[PDB]
């Protein structure tokens, strides 16, 4: 009584179809389930397959097709949203098992890459709201073709990219933060590989 999710990570571009694979190994008829786990939350039920129609529909527009011949139950969604970025778990229960708790796979992380249609990379400097001295460097508005690398200097801290969504404007943007208790923004993300057209005020 087991399930297997062959891939650990899956990347899909915002708006495009998504597929999360899962295969099962069962003695009798299988009862399959898919759950999603958003950051710092518990698992949330999406859909399940018990009997009949091999195409099942669930919460948040997700679907899955029970393919016996392939012993698979892949999770699918026509148009992926950035908010669909999470960990996905398929689980199974063998009909010939005897009412046991669900058995889960190792999960698969789904990353939905935001479509930055109006990139405008730039590195700004922000001052502390309580004291002079302290400052941080903000690399923002780059498209998702950009990769933020960690700092070589042990005294320099750089956070990974992070997409924010200003719903009131249907606007989304990436940004990474860098700071050091040592240091200047001009050379903060130097070690990364930043767009040639980055605005450095």
């Amino acid at each position: 009584q087991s399930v297997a999710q062959p891939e650990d990570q899956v990347n899909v571009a915002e708006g495009n179809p998504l597929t999360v694979k899962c295969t099962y190994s069962v003695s009798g008829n299988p009862y399959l389930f898919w759950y999603v786990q958003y950051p710092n939350r518990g698992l949330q039920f999406l859909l399940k397959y018990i009997t009949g129609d091999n195409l099942v529909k669930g919460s948040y527009g997700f679907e899955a097709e029970f393919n016996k011949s392939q012993t698979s139950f892949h999770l699918k969604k026509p148009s992926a949203l950035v908010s669909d970025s999470a960990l996905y778990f398929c689980a199974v229960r063998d009909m010939n098992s005897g009412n046991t708790p669900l058995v889960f796979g190792k999960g698969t992380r789904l990353s939905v890459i935001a479509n930055i249609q109006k990139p405008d990379p730039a590195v700004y400097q922000l001052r502390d709201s309580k004291s002079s001295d302290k400052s941080v460097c903000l690399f923002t508005d780059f498209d998702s073709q950009t990769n933020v690398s960690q700092s070589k200097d042990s005294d320099v801290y750089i956070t990974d990219k992070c997409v924010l969504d200003m719903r009131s404007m249907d606007f989304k943007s990436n940004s990474a933060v860098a700071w050091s208790n040592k240091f200047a923004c001009a050379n903060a993300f130097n070690n990364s590989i930043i767009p040639e057209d980055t605005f450095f005020p």
């Binding site: 939350r41 708790p101 730039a122 001052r127 956070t159 992070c162």
Partner: protein, 240 residues
């Protein structure tokens, strides 16, 4: 639904702890799983009804009881570092066609000694003129540093109310000392508003980090302040 308490917990090796789980859906079946990196969810123990408890895949080191249908407590006899993970309670109706309903989880960390627990220091960095003039948008950044263990919840607040729009918080904290069995952490987050909003002096912004640490019934004779569960914040006013 299914509820669990506490949501976060730090423990010293050897200590005992009871994680609570309740469900008000008349579910007969309740169960406990632990989730660890690269290992999915592993069944610890479960219960088919009151008076009965059933061994799971990894029962060693854990005890459970089911005196009532609503509750299913999980007790850690003598906490060990290997018991560090996230525990999920789940329930469901009896028949095999029913799916399970999960609680929010409990992030538990076991440490050799508590002298390694530290709350975060928080700072809010204001938007630069450059960004405002260049994009007509204003981004605030919040930094929480020096905390350990990694049990924190960062939230943004505007004029008295919590906000989520225009916010993204690092999915993972970063080690300040990559080479340390108990390196303290830093975490950042950003809040982005329109240049117009930030430029309104009457707008007040606040970043607060809820840290989960020691409790009252916890000893502490160190000079530094006892690192109890607390909220550390920093704020800033709009700028004309």
């Amino acid at each position: 639904g299914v509820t669990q308490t506490p949501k976060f917990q730090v423990l010293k090796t050897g200590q005992s702890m009871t994680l609570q789980c309740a469900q008000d859906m008349n579910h007969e079946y309740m169960s406990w799983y632990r989730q660890d990196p690269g290992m999915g969810l592993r069944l610890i123990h479960y219960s088919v009804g009151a008076g009965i408890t059933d061994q799971g895949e990894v029962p060693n080191g854990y005890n459970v009881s089911r005196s009532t249908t609503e509750d299913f407590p999980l007790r850690l006899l003598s906490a060990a570092p290997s018991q560090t993970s996230v525990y999920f309670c789940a329930s469901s109706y009896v028949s095999q066609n029913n799916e399970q309903f999960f609680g929010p989880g409990t992030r538990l960390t076991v440490l050799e000694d508590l002298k390694n627990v530290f709350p975060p220091e928080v700072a809010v960095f204001e938007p630069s003129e450059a960004e405002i003039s260049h994009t007509q948008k204003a981004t605030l950044v919040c930094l929480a540093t020096g905390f350990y263990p990694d049990h924190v919840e960062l939230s943004w607040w505007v004029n008295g109310k919590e906000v989520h729009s225009g916010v993204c918080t690092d999915p993972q904290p970063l080690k300040e000392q990559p080479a340390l069995n108990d390196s303290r952490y830093s975490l950042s987050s950003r809040l982005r508003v329109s240049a117009t909003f930030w430029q309104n002096p009457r707008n007040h912004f606040r970043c607060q980090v809820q840290f989960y640490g020691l409790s009252e019934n916890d000893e502490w004779t160190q000079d530094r302040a006892k690192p109890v569960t607390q909220i550390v914040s920093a704020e800033a006013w709009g700028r004309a």
